[PDB]
UniProtKB/Swiss-Prot annotation:
It is found in: Cell membrane; Cell projection, Phagocytic cup; Early endosome; Nucleus. Phosphorylated on its cytoplasmic domain by PKCzeta/PRKCZ upon ligand binding. Phosphorylated by ATM following DNA damage. This is Advanced glycosylation end product-specific receptor. Changing residue 13 to R: Less monoubiquitinated product and resistant to degradation. Induction: Induced in T cells by antigen stimulation and by the S100B ligand. Induced in trophoblasts by DNA damage. Constitutive homodimer; disulfide-linked. Forms homooligomers. Interacts with S100A1 and APP. Interacts with S100B, S100A12 and S100A14. Interacts with TIRAP. Interacts with HMGB1. Interacts with LGP2; this interaction plays an important role in AGER-mediated pro-inflammatory responses and cytokine release. Interacts with double-strand break repair protein MRE11 which is a core component of the MRN complex. The interaction enhances MRE11 endonuclease activity and promotes DNA repair.
Length: 15
């Protein structure tokens, strides 16, 4: 839910 994309560099799903 949170801090999932933080490992990729986005943190959260965004457009």
């Amino acid at each position: 839910m949170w801090q999932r994309r933080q490992r990729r560099g986005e943190e959260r799903k965004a457009p």
